[PDB]
Design an enzyme around this catalytic site. Structure first.
Site: not given
Ligand code: SF4
Lengths: 289, 287
Positions: B10, B15, B41, B129
């Site tokens: 997510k 990440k 994003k 996610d």
């Protein structure tokens, strides 16, 4: 003569909490409201029903012989203030599309005549992060005309608000879907207040209300309730009531003016969220001074 | 024998930072690597190229009309240590689909011969996610053989790890997509170490590495670089080299065993992230 509204925003910022509290206050004022959960991620109904998890239309399908064999009463469940609730259910991991499931759920509710009932408001609680065609389906399909964007004073929440505004514009050339305002879910972050007012202004809308951070919101939460129900004599209750009244009497509905990334970063640096980037050190290893 | 990998997880837990540092460590080791960002994003190539934002395949076609009228050279850039970087480009707000976007980028690069170039690894940096059909496309299409899930010791992130595991479960019978391990991006939380090792176990996989929080990460980050390049002598560098070493030699690739939400909460409570629910005071006013 109901008003179809949608609260959009990214996750991790209390959007569902503000939505349920907002919906509670409205009921308290004498309004019949229905909540349609459209966020794969965070239970937008638990606070209205004291429930740990309301069964979704999607699971009641991927198990109970698919949609046509479902009974409205097994899906719709009323709670505090007699506020009706519904949870669409997110996509089957790896295969489904959030958009499709949400539409299937709305269709169901229409067909089974859930709107033909005396209802003042209907709030769709949609995940407003990566606004793909999927999550924008509630807009493309004219299922919600007034959208309120929950955001906070941090980069991703605001990037999310910009994206949600671009989604709205995309369908502005065809409908009553309009942006009614921004709702700042305070993070006790300096100048968050002004940041959101400035953002709203650039977008062509308004900051309908600033929801403060209050430790009562959480106490009313681990007991699965809204503030309005826990302690109606709480300052916070008045906070949502102020928001509930403003949504009721709201007349500003516009086609947003999304901003650029530089424009957005400018905003952040301008109000002290992100610092100015020191160009001199970009790409310089420690060995290089 | 090029390995097709992907890092899933997510947003908001570092990440992409771990992905780029890990790729940095592989390049330092002599591996020719390519990163294909598939996260709407999060910039997944900026630490490798020292740039604020890399022109995406999508927006570089919305320009020139469409993909065919596109030059590889304008989409694939090389940065630190020869690592090649490509940015898919998230969905056009209100209309696009991640599944469509990624396939467009994969198909183009294949048509342009970006893969058969002597390359030891390809890393798809994917948002994991809500694991809708769109974000699972790299899986459905068998483009990402070994998946590594970045998560941290918290609900949403572990829940995301679980949903990614189901995505992998769903296409078991058709390709060679497997779960290679979990990567814990430390959040300075007590026992996070154990929690994630417990989750992996339940999932049937392994905690390939625990990435500590260390300010040198933010300092490299602010200069648009990975720790490996910024300060090769820093302890964190070794932390990333260790992860890269385990990835290169990794042979524990499996089909995950998802858990229930209840099985997940029992994990949080045991290792004390989530508290027990006072049955009695539910919806009971207070007064
Ligand atoms: S349109 Fe969106 S929710 Fe639907 S499959 Fe594509 S990325 Fe997922």
């Amino acid at each position: 003569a109901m008003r179809q509204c949608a609260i959009y925003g990214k996750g991790g910022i209390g959007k569902s909490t503000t939505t349920q509290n907002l919906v509670a206050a409205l009921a308290e004022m004498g309004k019949k409201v229905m909540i349609v959960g459209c966020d794969p991620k965070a239970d937008s109904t638990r606070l209205i029903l004291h429930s740990k998890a309301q069964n979704t239309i999607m699971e009641m399908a991927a198990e109970a012989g698919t949609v046509e064999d479902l009974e409205l009463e097994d899906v719709l469940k009323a709670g505090y203030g007699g506020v009706k609730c519904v949870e669409s259910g997110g996509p089957e991991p790896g295969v489904g599309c959030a958009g499709r499931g949400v539409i299937t759920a709305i269709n169901f509710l229409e067909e089974e005549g859930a709107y033909e009932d005396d209802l003042d408001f209907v709030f769709y609680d949609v995940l407003g992060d990566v606004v793909c065609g999927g999550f924008a389906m509630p807009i493309r399909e004219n299922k919600a005309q007034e959208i309120y964007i929950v955001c906070s004073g941090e980069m991703m929440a605001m990037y999310a608000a910009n994206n949600i505004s671009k989604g709205i514009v995309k369908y502005a050339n065809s409908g009553s879907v309009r942006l009614g305002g921004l709702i700042c879910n305070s993070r006790n972050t300096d100048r968050e207040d002004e940041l959101i007012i400035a953002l709203a202004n650039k977008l062509g809308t308004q900051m309908i209300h600033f929801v403060p951070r209050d430790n009562v919101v959480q106490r009313a939460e681990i007991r699965r309730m809204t503030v309005i129900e826990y302690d109606p004599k709480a300052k916070q209750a008045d906070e949502y009531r102020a928001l509930a009244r403003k949504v009721v009497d709201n007349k500003l509905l516009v086609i947003p003016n999304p901003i650029t990334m530089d424009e957005l970063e400018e905003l952040l640096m301008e109000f002290g969220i992100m610092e100015v980037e020191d160009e001199s050190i970009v790409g310089k290893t420690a060995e290089e001074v």
